[PDB]
Ligand binder design. Structure first.
Ligand code: HEM
Ligand SMILES: Oc1ccc(-c2n[nH]c(NCc3c[nH]cn3)c2-c2ccc(O)cc2)cc1
Ligand SMILES: Oc1ccc(-c2n[nH]c(NCc3c[nH]cn3)c2-c2ccc(O)cc2)cc1
Length: 393
């Protein structure tokens, strides 16, 4: 027998029985990644939070030359430190303000786009693909709006993502090609006088502001590419697997349809049980640090298994069930924790809440149109998603 390998399963509709067993017996244990490197897999809520809240477990240094790797880089090394670069350039507050869902028109844009997507589906008739023809276009449309770039440009940028967020043992030639092309697109956007709204609009004017004159010009285009990619792949994938969890629970579906004011509470539970992250979050130990029964050594790789924490019965009793009245409802790790907590968390919540609200209104009888085992789960990818999500209503 060989050392236990990660990831365990590409299926995003059920957590393996093995996670519970692992968490109970060995909440931190050694595993092998797809590159052949060894790593510590952390799977209890307590130890996951300890790692995420201790900056000596570094995200930046996972990109160091010769480090044990979860997967191959699909960005330049320094872009792993993207938020650190943004903060050092003085751009953190501006980036945050631009990607809030409280921007005027934004919530109405989401509703209009979702409703328009659903009407098209209805007109075509069942079956409909809720991933390719609903959740992902909605994510793509949203991030075009958030960035301030043409809606028409969305599908072209989206096409990079099935490779850009691969979880590969080896570097990917196509990833570099798409990167260079997408970076050039965003640089053009910065020079485009028509682009005055959203994130790219704000970055364009900060670029001409004397207070930012010494900010690297390549960081501006990089922010656009990375926030579009991360936002679209994360919201599209989350909404998709959230719709599966909802569909699998007709009474919850009915309840939220009847009482839509419960939808935010519903989405928060759907976030907690969400299996969209295919791998643990990687960190490199920059010191010798005790984690449970293991002294992690400087230079070693640690993987924070989000569903390990989020299904931990010591923190979330009956973790497999959706409870709209938990006393600790946002304390899940779906958005991470600590220094690198997701900057798009508000946008991600609203994308899901509005998508679900529109869906339940337009398709109250929504149900899977194929047996659940017929869903095709994407492999070697940083997210777990079904290639198609056929439904009827
Ligand atoms: C439901 C939707 C989303 C989920 C589940 C999600 C999940 C996460 C998680 C778990 C992390 C932490 C990664 C780590 O600590 O290693 C993260 C970070 C990040 N997220 Fe999200 N995210 C979502 C939406 C978004 C959106 C809408 C954006 C931007 C528009 C975004 C951009 C980012 C960026 C740039 C980081 C890196 C933060 C850093 O390095 O400090 N995400 N996300
Ligand atoms: O056009 C794009 C947009 C995004 C990525 C991307 N792919 N994978 C990751 N994640 C870290 C990673 C893992 N393996 C290799 N890179 C990112 C990313 C996300 C956000 C961020 O701030 C910094 C990088 C790639 C191409
Ligand atoms: O298993 C591993 C992990 C990482 C490296 C590594 N390669 N290049 C660097 N260079 C940055 C660097 C900063 N200070 C001293 N090295 C490091 C490294 C080491 C330890 C550390 O705490 C932070 C980074 C090598 C093997």
């Amino acid at each position: 027998t060989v050392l236990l390998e990660v990831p365990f399963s590409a299926r995003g509709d059920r957590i393996p029985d093995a996670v519970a067993e692992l968490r109970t017996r060995e909440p931190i244990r050694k595993v092998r990644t797809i590159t052949g490197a060894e790593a510590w897999l952390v799977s209890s809520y307590a130890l996951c939070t300890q790692v995420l809240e201790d900056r000596r477990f570094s995200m930046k240094e996972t990109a160091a030359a010769g480090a044990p790797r979860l997967n191959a880089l699909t960005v330049p090394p320094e872009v792993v430190n993207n938020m650190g670069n943004i903060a050092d350039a003085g751009l953190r507050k501006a980036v945050m303000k631009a990607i809030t869902p409280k921007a005027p028109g934004l919530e109405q844009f989401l509703r209009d786009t979702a409703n328009s997507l659903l009407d098209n589906l209805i007109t075509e008739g069942a079956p409909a693909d809720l991933r390719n023809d609903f959740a992902d276009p909605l994510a793509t449309a949203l991030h075009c709006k958030v960035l301030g770039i043409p809606q028409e440009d969305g599908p072209k940028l989206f096409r990079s993502l099935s490779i850009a967020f691969m979880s590969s043992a080896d570097p990917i030639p196509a990833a570099k090609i798409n990167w260079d092309r997408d970076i050039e697109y965003m640089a053009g956007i910065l020079e485009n006088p028509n682009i005055t709204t959203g994130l790219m609009g704000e970055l364009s004017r900060l670029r001409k502001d004397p207070a930012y004159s010494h900010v690297s010009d390549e960081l501006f285009a990089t922010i656009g590419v990375t926030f579009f990619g991360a936002g679209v792949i994360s919201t599209g994938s989350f909404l998709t697997t959230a719709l599966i969890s909802l569909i699998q629970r007709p009474q919850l579906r009915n309840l939220l349809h009847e009482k839509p004011e419960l939808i935010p509470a519903g989405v928060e539970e759907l976030l907690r049980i969400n299996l969209s992250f295919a791998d643990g979050l990687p960190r490199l130990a920059t010191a010798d640090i005790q984690v449970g029964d293991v002294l992690v050594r400087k230079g070693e790789l640690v993987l924070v298994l989000l569903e390990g924490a989020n299904f931990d019965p010591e923190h979330f009793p009956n973790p497999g069930s959706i409870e709209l009245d938990r006393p600790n409802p946002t304390s899940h790790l779906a958005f991470g924790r600590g220094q690198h907590f997701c900057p798009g968390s508000a946008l991600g919540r609203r994308h899901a809440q509005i998508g679900i609200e529109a869906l339940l209104k337009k398709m109250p009888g929504v149900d899977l149109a194929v047996p659940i085992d017929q869903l095709v789960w994407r492999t070697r990818f940083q997210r777990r998603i079904p290639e198609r999500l056929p439904v009827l209503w």
